[PDB]
Symmetry: C2
Subunit: 68 residues, 2 copies
Amino acid sequence: MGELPIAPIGRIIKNAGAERVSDDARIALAKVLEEMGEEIASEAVKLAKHAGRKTIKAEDIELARKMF
Amino acid sequence: MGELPIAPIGRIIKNAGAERVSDDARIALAKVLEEMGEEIASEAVKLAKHAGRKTIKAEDIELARKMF
Ligand SMILES: [Cl-]
Ligand SMILES: [Cl-]
């Protein structure tokens, strides 16, 4: 948790069509995306270990995302 | 799209327990999180306009996340 920088998150909300954005909404969306990222990456670690690898690959992320 | 920097995404996957991460998995998870962020923020813009505001607030992000 707390990995994403806040300035890029406000650009996500502006690019989605917001006129103005509070810094409290940037912190809220960063928390949602870091939680979703942790859930998908923990499934991807298990998929890589099931495949016999130590490296997480794109295919592990794509398959993990389909579990959600 | 393309708002999130790639280095913080690799920290999400390492913090979730990966030993090693390919730069192709960092690009893949960034794409997933930017898509989810756009969907949640577009719903939050509609909630703010329904409330009569031009500013997106934390409560708009939290309510939008419950629609997913
Ligand atoms: Cl490996
Ligand atoms: Cl306002």
